Design a protein around this ligand. Sequence first.
Ligand code: YJQ
Length: 238
Amino acid sequence: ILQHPDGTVLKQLQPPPRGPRELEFYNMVYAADCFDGVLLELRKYLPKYYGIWSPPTAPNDLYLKLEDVTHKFNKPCIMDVKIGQKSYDPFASSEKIQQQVSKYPLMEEIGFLVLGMRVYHVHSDSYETENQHYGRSLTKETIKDGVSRFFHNGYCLRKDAVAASIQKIEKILQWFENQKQLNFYASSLLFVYEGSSGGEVEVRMIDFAHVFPSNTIDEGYVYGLKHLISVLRSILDN
Ligand SMILES: O=C(Nc1ccc(-c2onc3ccc(-c4nnn[nH]4)cc23)cc1)C1CC1
């Protein structure tokens, strides 16, 4: 992810088939002649899409030009959470499934995985960062405290941001419960709140290299959202 001063990010397409698939996802959603109510509503929850981009001198080098969801914040606190019970897709090989489940074997049980967070601390004027190993270390016993960490500025628990996060996730859940045409594997929610202008929060869906047509509710994604909501709700009682 490359941040551009103009309030956009450039995401380099992943190798095939992942990058092409994400391009076609955005292209389908933001299709100019799209009157599909499901896809029109979904746009609210994605980064705004500015189409494919490549350097003037390098047509080979493919990027998606996307809204930088963090742009409007002064000291953005950012958390990326992978959603779902399965991070492999319906066409994965046996080896691929094993690879994906081994990366985090609690995915079925918990239904989400914290990919990372960056938290601004007021008293130190500094950021705490957690990498992929943080979230992959979390269990049923430690997931609540693991998530809570995102909302600690080093003096208070930001229950305002927690409550706002629940409310915005709920709208995404409502979208999922009113569509049976897309299933999303290994996709994420990006959480942003203001670390320095009170209860201001972004929660957006990102990373669409494994989105597939479906005839059914995305039960795994729904489960993940429900559990994440439940965890956030309990944090409100801290
Ligand atoms: O450590 C940082 N991380 C960070 C900052 C902005 C974003 C971000 O903002 N808008 C975005 C829209 C799509 C995607 C995206 N799609 N697929 N993978 N990422 C990512 C987006 C992500 C991470 C801060 C210091 C820069």
